[PDB]
Amino acid sequence: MGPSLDFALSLLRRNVRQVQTDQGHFTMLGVRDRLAVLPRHSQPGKTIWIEHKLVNILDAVELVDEQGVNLELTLITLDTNEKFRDITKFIPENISTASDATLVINTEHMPSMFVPVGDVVQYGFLNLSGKPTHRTMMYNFPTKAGQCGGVVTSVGKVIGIHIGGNGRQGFCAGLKRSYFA
Numbered sequence: 001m002g003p004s005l006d007f008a009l010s011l012l013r014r015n016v017r018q019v020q021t022d023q024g025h026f027t028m029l030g031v032r033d034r035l036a037v038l039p040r041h042s043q044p045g046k047t048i049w050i051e052h053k054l055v056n057i058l059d060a061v062e063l064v065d066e067q068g069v070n071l072e073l074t075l076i077t078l079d080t081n082e083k084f085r086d087i088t089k090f091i092p093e094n095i096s097t098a099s100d101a102t103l104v105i106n107t108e109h110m111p112s113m114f115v116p117v118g119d120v121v122q123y124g125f126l127n128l129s130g131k132p133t134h135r136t137m138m139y140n141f142p143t144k145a146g147q148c149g150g151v152v153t154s155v156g157k158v159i160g161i162h163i164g165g166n167g168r169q170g171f172c173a174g175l176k177r178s179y180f181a
């Protein structure tokens with residue numbers, strides 16, 4: 001096995017989970033300890049369904065920038081025994097671009113799905129069905145419903161969470177390491 005494939009599969013096995021909220025199916029990224037991240041629009045309630053079981057959410061922090069503008073991420077703290085393998089060191093200190101990224105999706109409807117979205121570029125501002133949103137990046141791939149939460153990855157780096165699309169292009173909320181400090 002090559003190393004790119006080994007890293008994505010390991011991500012699926014240890015960190016990228018199938019979840020459902022009352023808003024539908026999403027891909028969740030577990031980052032470290034009991035800390036995971038979802039797209040804010042998933043609106044996790046007091047419990048969330050993770051793979052095969054209902055898991056209690058102890059805390060949910062919706063991330064905004066300094067202008068109070070939406071970043072489209074929610075940090076959730078889970079009531080579980082598991083500590084996620086810590087992948088914080090694979091998350092850049094600042095929102096970074098990449099070449100030939102792969103989007104890793106894991107949902108009940110789209111299990112263990114690899115989507116070659118190509119180069120990921122700085123985009124910045126995105127208007128999400130009436131909600132202004134900062135710190136996004138963009139890939140010219142026609143992503144679809146059911147793919148939100150998907151993890152944007154390239155050469156052993158975890159750089160974003162899939163949040164939206166327009167039929168031609170897709171957009172992620174950029175990851176930075178300090179969110180998970």
Ligand SMILES: */C(=C/C(=O)OCC)[C@H](C[C@@H]1CCNC1=O)NC(=O)[C@@H](CC(=O)[C@@H](N)C(C)C)Cc1ccc(F)cc1
Pocket residue numbers: 023024025041072128129130131142143144145146147148163164165166167170171
């Ligand atoms: C992922 C979430 C989803 O499936 O919604 C139903 C649960 C999608 C992915 C989009 C859909 C089409 N292509 C994609 O990659 N995210 C959304 O649908 C997102 C809104 C958009 O993408 C808009 N372009 C819209 C016109 C389809 C959801 C969203 C709504 C409101 C917000 F404040 C933030 C996000």
